[PDB]
DNA sequence: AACACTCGTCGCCCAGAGTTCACCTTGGAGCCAGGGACGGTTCATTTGGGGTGCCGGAAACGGACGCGTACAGGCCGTATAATGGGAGCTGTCACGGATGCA
């Protein structure tokens, strides 16, 4: 499933589609600490995201 | 061994990336209405053409028909005198019985 299809907010979307995120299944692959090293990371993006 | 200087690190503070959320337009995509000319169809010619069955007959042609020639096979005759065969090579044994003689 994309992220996309999650149907979140602006900056995850964004800071996603940049580097080339395109589903869910390497999110679910990625932990927590693993996709929470970019830079400039939204903590309510790590709210949703968890 | 005693003494007086300059550099990451972090937080914090303001501006936009670019993204979402969310407002107006206008070229529509199509839907329908109307008008050819057009190509498909059909039907009048049209006499240009294919056509032909048979023949006078001319000439080939297939064969009959009669009459010559050709070797193949057959018949026939040869007048000094010429008057009874070469050859075969045979080392068996058993043995039953006829058999020409006993």
Redesign the pocket.
């Known amino acids: 499933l994309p992220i996309?299809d999650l149907?979140?907010?602006?900056?995850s979307?964004?800071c996603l589609?940049?580097e080339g995120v395109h589903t869910v299944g390497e999110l679910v692959a990625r932990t927590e600490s693993d996709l929470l090293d970019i830079r400039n990371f939204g903590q309510k993006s790590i709210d949703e995201v968890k």
């Open positions: 996309d149907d979140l907010t602006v900056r979307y964004n589609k940049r």
